[PDB]
Design a protein around this ligand. Structure first.
Ligand SMILES: N#Cc1ccc(-c2nc3ccccc3c(=O)[nH]2)cc1
Ligand SMILES: [Zn+2]
Length: 208
């Protein structure tokens, strides 16, 4: 049921998604080990992910959460990187897309920093890097990330350096407590709480 609609680079929607991609790059504590060395991306394509059944699955859950939280879904747009991006856009998020070993338990993880999600494009820790060159810092190969609509509801705040949500909460927020430049990361424990709105195709760019 999924169709992908290309956005034009002239479209304000392309431009605002690109700006969120580019402006949320940061340096990582691994010096680029997992995701590569870069300060910015070459955006090759942005597509809207259109699936009526998956969208209705998301909105149904969003209303349930909203009604449990004084009519506030606490909806965000966040990045997701995964080797399973193709399955996700076709079948939706579910338990098979969870980070079993994540620091907030087995759930589906999202990031404010696009460069954080970029570390997972080729697997946990960047895996063995790109299929073609086995390079986690490949500047040639095309990568994909999702920019997703995510319902957080009442989020459990974890200060720090599938399972169930903590009782009385709908998500977990991983607040950065050491690296002053890191943005928040978030975990949901029901795949119905995220919709993969945009598929972004890009390369990381070698710094000059
Ligand atoms: N298998 C698998 C698997 C796929 C994706 C991730 C993943 N983790 C993150 C952890 C923190 C912040 C963001 C992410 C993310 O975008 N993605 C983790 C594991
Ligand atoms: Zn490559």
């Amino acid at each position: 049921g999924t169709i992908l609609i290309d956005l034009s680079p002239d479209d304000k929607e392309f431009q605002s998604v690109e700006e969120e991609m580019q402006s949320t790059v940061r340096e990582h504590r691994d010096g680029g080990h997992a995701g590569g060395i870069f300060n910015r991306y070459n955006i090759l394509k942005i597509q809207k992910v259109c699936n009526k059944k998956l969208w209705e699955r998301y909105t149904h859950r969003r209303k349930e959460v909203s009604e449990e939280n004084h009519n506030h879904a606490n909806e965000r747009m966040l990045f997701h990187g995964s080797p399973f991006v193709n399955a996700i856009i076709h079948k939706g998020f579910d338990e098979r897309h969870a980070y079993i070993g994540g620091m907030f338990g087995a759930g589906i993880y999202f990031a404010e920093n696009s460069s954080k999600s970029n570390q997972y494009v080729y697997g946990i820790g960047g895996g063995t890097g790109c299929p073609v060159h086995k390079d986690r810092s490949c500047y040639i190969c095309h990568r994909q990330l999702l920019f997703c609509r995510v319902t957080l509801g009442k989020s459990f705040l974890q200060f720090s350096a599938m399972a169930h949500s903590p009782p009385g909460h709908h998500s977990v927020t991983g607040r950065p407590s050491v690296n002053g430049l890191a943005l928040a990361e978030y975990v949901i424990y029901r795949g119905e709480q995220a919709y993969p709105e945009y598929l972004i195709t890009y390369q990381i760019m070698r710094p000059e």
